[PDB]
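Holo prediction. Input below; ligand is magnesium ion.
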Amino acid sequence: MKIKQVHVRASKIKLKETFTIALGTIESADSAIVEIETEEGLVGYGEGGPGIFITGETLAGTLETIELFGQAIIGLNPFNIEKIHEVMDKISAFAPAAKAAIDIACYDLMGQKAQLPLYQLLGGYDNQVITDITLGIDEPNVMAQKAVEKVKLGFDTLKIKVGTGIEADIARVKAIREAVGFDIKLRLDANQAWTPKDAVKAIQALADYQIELVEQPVKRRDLEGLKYVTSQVNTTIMADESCFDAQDALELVKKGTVDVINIKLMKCGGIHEALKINQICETAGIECMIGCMAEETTIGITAAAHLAAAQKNITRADLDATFGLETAPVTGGVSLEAKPLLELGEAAGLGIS
Ligand SMILES: CC[C@H](C)[C@H](N)C(=O)N[C@@H](Cc1ccc(O)cc1)C(=O)O
Ligand SMILES: [Mg+2]
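Structure of the complex:
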């Protein structure tokens, strides 16, 4: 199998509602959709959803980088994922969205050529994944009503966004808990908003509210502060922005910084690197949660779901980016439907057309 041409295009899909997190707001999912065409005619789908307040990547930068990657990999075999990443890493020192776009399309092609659903090539542990759904920052009563609405849709796990001030954030969590009861799992995400001290204070104040875990409570560069929180509360602490790639994972494991790690294809540059992060974590006794950017869509989410289903150590999933999209840019894959169960069919590769 040989790559004949790499096609890329901008995709801009308005969100049904603006989403607010501690780092900013998003109202449109703008990504780069890649289609790698092979000599034999098979076409693999890839996507790069750059979140500027997460990685600094922009759609224009991502598009330009993908084009450079595209020309450099013509003639290569999609199965030679080792060389494909070698080439991209030599071209750019940092562009996870662009690298993920290429990587995802290559894996899609691998599955199609082998005539197997992607999850079978990535571990084969399962063929489905259960995802939580995220509640953007808003007034306590508002988030609470939304929570009740989501639970009605069948979600048993809600990811609560917080980060404007511990006082207000605690109020948000209490309102949500009171509204939905204790049969619902609640995980919090402060998106780097709290100081180490305030994080501990807030987590302790929510002790009787049965919090499943707390994601990135402190600034990403403050690994000492992150470890401080982890070592000061029994509550599970998850690293997100503090862990982009395998090297970061290796650093957090040596330091014992967190309890769990959030893996994003858009942070590590693809499935190839995501696998490394998970393997490092599993070896260290750290479970992983597959996540996503609000900028990605069907392709990115579908690839993430196949990886999450295939690997035993990826025990949690936050793959809800398609739920806010006004439209789907492609056919097949994970639906725009807001549902907790993401079942992967038997279609080869990503099952996208
Ligand atoms: C809006 C929630 C998204 C789909 C996901 N569950 C999420 O929370 N992702 C990031 C935060 C984020 C990234 C990019 C962006 O444009 C908005 C929000 C996370 O912290 O896990
Ligand atoms: Mg997060």
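Residues 46 and 104 are 5 Å apart (CA to CA). That is the main takeaway for now.
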